[PDB]
């Protein structure tokens with residue numbers, strides 16, 4: 001039996017690791033570094049040979065990491081999320097070929113599949129009577145981490161006047177510190193699926209069938225499969241589009257970290273404002289999806305049809321508002337799906353709704369974005385993502401009227 005750690009020395013260390021694991025100052029400046037004068041990649045080599053591997057590998061490492069999170073009891077996947085971080089920035093700084101960058105998207109996809117390895121780690125580390133206070137602190141330390149990583153990434157690049165290569169060495173110093181902090185995390189002794197002391201498969205699938213016939217779980221899983229697949233396709237490719245609108249030689253004029261800190265801050269407000277409307281706007285739920293996906297159709301169209309370099313600040317605001325539109329509906333989706341679900345069925349449905357959204361993200365990425373598919377440039381393929389949300393916002397508006405006229 002291992003010694004119980006001090007309680008105030010654990011929540012302070014869960015919040016300090018969860019803050020320091022999000023410090024990647026050169027993360028918003030990966031694409032202006034790859035497309036810059038430091039890396040020798042063509043604009044069509046990044047958007048068609050490199051960036052679709054971020055979607056392919058995330059389909060390949062999604063299942064494995066989702067199962068190894070519960071099998072290894074959530075600590076070596078927090079180390080694998082930090083060591084694949086080091087392997088991304090070791091390939092940013094030392095990789096030169098296109099295959100070295102497709103390997104970098106293989107290691108970045110491990111860090112995206114192991115993003116739930118920290119929210120589900122505190123779920124199994126902390127007793128349920130004490131969980132909602134630590135999960136409130138650690139979600140505030142993660143959100144403070146991804147905010148100030150983009151602020152420190154911006155102040156070093158704009159105010160500090162450091163290069164993108166020096167910023168990736170500052171990021172590699174913060175990332176080897178996050179591997180050291182992940183070593184001293186307290187590994188749990190019982191997980192949710194594979195390391196409990198006991199079937200679970202029988203309890204879930206008997207409850208999954210009865211909870212699949214709810215018209216709030218099906219509606220917000222259909223949102224999670226399709227509206228979140230189009231969201232990350234805009235998120236992966238908007239920095240390639242900002243390198244087309246404002247191709248500035250100076251790194252201090254980039255402001256990619258100022259737009260990924262504003263969309264973190266605006267995404268925090270819309271996630272806070274969604275806690276007040278997740279239970280009461282459940283009636284007008286298809287109209288809330290169609291009202292936001294129509295806004296997400298206009299902002300991608302506004303991104304796809306700005307070509308003047310002085311209107312790059314409109315392209316930053318059309319993405320901060322784009323992220324804030326999606327982060328408004330995620331706490332509403334998280335509640336309407338997981339309302340009457342078991343905690344083992346929350347991790348199964350959200351693990352499947354992420355997996356089905358990654359299949360849709362892989363199918364579009366291969367057809368629209370890959371050089372083996374259509375090979376479209378970032379500006380033309382942002383016009384197909386604009387009519388992707390418009391087709392989605394038509395279906396949820398027709399679904400709000402084909403079921404709004406029944407009474």
Ligand SMILES: Nc1nc(=O)c2c(CCc3ccc(C(=O)N[C@@H](CCC(=O)O)C(=O)O)cc3)c[nH]c2[nH]1
Nearest residue numbers: 030031034046051105108112146235236239260264
């Ligand atoms: N060439 C190239 N360009 C890139 O942009 C890139 C990246 C970043 C891709 C990436 C960025 C954010 C999220 C994501 O899921 N974002 C989260 C959190 C972000 C935050 O909090 O700031 C979200 O849900 O918004 C998912 C994926 C890795 N390798 C790359 N290679």
